[PDB]
């Protein structure tokens, strides 16, 4: 923007620079070179008078185009500041000389040609200092830690927020598209053996399929990716708080009150991706126990009636051959031992306080009938 | 010996590994070794603090100041520590979100599990020595490169600054207690010290002098946001006791400065105000006696009669000349009034005066216009 300016800021450096390390007092080449400075303090001034520099913005957040504005030739500023800041202390190495070779017998009328100069130079200097050194320094300062927070820190979040919500929808997807739709049909053996393999390793998921090995492992990855982002939540309120009052710039007020609501809005954002996993866990894991015990108390209420009839039957009808009697017993024996097995396991299996209260409840109430049953199975295949 | 020389053995090969974790594609065993390695190594690094306790509460001490000094000197390779071990949980995100896309069901998920675990195992160790560990140092670190700006490079520049400012105002003074006319001069300046044409390069020296003074007194109150800032705003309990050291460290210059101040004002009057008192309370005097001389001459002229010509027309001359001189003298004085240089108790002596020479000039006026008259 202030092309101008760009064609003395390398001139202005070299003149400063040069009085900077000047040990000599060139009363000539010195007044030459002050002199110019202190109308191209002037000039650059003039140019900076809100022509394109900072102003009240109270009106509207288009001053973040400004902040923006400032970043994109930020590199020029910053060599502004650091050369001005410089002024005052290069004006006072060139007093000190003037000190030193003012000696008392000679009129030294050069001495009131500078001194006249160099105030004349700080007057302007003073001038414009205040403005870029407490308010443009800090609006670049300001505004590059703004875009870190919004852009760098926020934005990234949301990103992050909106992947683990997809990734917390992906799963479902893999679930739906799988063997097992719903309410999947096992065997009693294979029920107990995949019961007993769950026994044996917070909760985790059951294994319906080779799918399930799949959505376990992806669900974990999902499970650990919150955190960071929590903390992330949680330690970014520093950062908010330390910018939204610290800074103390006239354009603050409005900055904080975009940055709260953006925090609000992700905040907001989060909670939804929080609560979306935690339904999903209920889902992928508290269900799933429950259909497995489902699945488990038909079975195992069936092959009890199995056992139940067979009773019946070997007391009704003892007159029979003993190829059908011994048929009649092993088939008693292999199924009796089964249904304890499967008690036995499913008693020693953690997940049973997951289970829906009314499911639990069927599972006891075979429980109770086994406990009647089991003892008329056993003094049968006592005499065997 | 120093606990980040123990750190500083393989802080390369820990950036080395996570650099080669970044960019890695379908690297199995391999990976479990420079995860693996990672964890001993982080773990490793976790001891070395409880060692030697980079972050420590030594608020109840004083030797804050000697830990941050420590800090700085090594502060270069912290840094380069801090940013790898930060760095490792998104970088395993990415090796998991590798091992992810892998899929291929139970296979490729048997080794997952033995990766999963692995990764997780690190982080445990990232996160606890990691989170507590850096925040502290990272802070630390910065809290001190601020306090040694603030106390070294601002506030000990400028208790320098404001010495030279008082050994610049008593070197003039010895100067001042070491070593013509100003005749219608006076009239032509009618706050300029130009009583000693040779040592009016003395008030060029006094002149720097009241001009060095705001910028120091500028930096005065503008250190007081860099020490507000810095007091309150750190997270650590340990800034308490820097905030309290600062605040003696401002006062004890504050004073200093108010001092050279007051020296200053104190010259101010010794250079300016004494030397223009004088140079009028001179001209009363020269004034009061060149009254007289007319008062006298008047009194010859009149006392002895006839005279020479000779005679008669010195006395008039010198009545004429004295007469000039001292309405020269007033007109000088009173225009001091007006700059207002003239003391409001030697105006009293100057108007003590003019009463006088408003009786006499009538007397010494007669006398000369009867000459003027004549033609």
Known sequence: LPMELQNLLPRLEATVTDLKLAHKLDVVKIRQQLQWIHDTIII???????????????????????????????????????????????????????????????????????????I?????????????????????????????????????????????????????????????????????????????????????????????????????????????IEQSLTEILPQRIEQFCGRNIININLLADFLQLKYKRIMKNFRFMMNEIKDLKIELIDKRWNILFINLNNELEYIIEEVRLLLKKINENDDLAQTIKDRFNSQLAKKSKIITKTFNIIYRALEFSLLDAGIALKTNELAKVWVDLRPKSDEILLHI
């Open 44 to 118: 650059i001034q003039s140019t900076l008078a809100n022509g394109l520099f900072p102003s009240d913005f109270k009106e509207y957040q288009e001053m973040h185009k400004y902040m923006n504005a400032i970043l994109e030739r930020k590199v020029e500023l910053f060599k502004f500041i650091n050369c001005i800041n410089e002024v005052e202390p290069v004006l006072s190495h060139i007093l000190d000389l003037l000190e030193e070779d003012l000696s008392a017998t000679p009129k030294g009328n050069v001495d009131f040609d500078l001194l006249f100069d160099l």
């Open 120 to 228: 004349e130079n700080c007057t302007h200097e003073s001038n414009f200092l205040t403005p870029n050194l407490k308010q443009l320094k800090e609006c670049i300062d300001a505004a590059m830690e703004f875009n870190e927070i919004s852009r760098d820190h926020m934005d990234t979040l949301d990103d992050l927020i909106n992947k683990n919500v997809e990734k917390c929808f992906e799963i479902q997807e893999l679930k739906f598209s799988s063997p097992v739709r719903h309410t999947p049909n096992f065997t009693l053996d294979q029920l107990i053996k995949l019961l007993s393999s769950n026994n044996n390793t917070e909760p985790k998921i059951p294994n319906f399929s080779p799918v399930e090995e799949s959505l376990s492992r992806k669900f974990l990855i999902l499970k650990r990716n919150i955190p960071p």
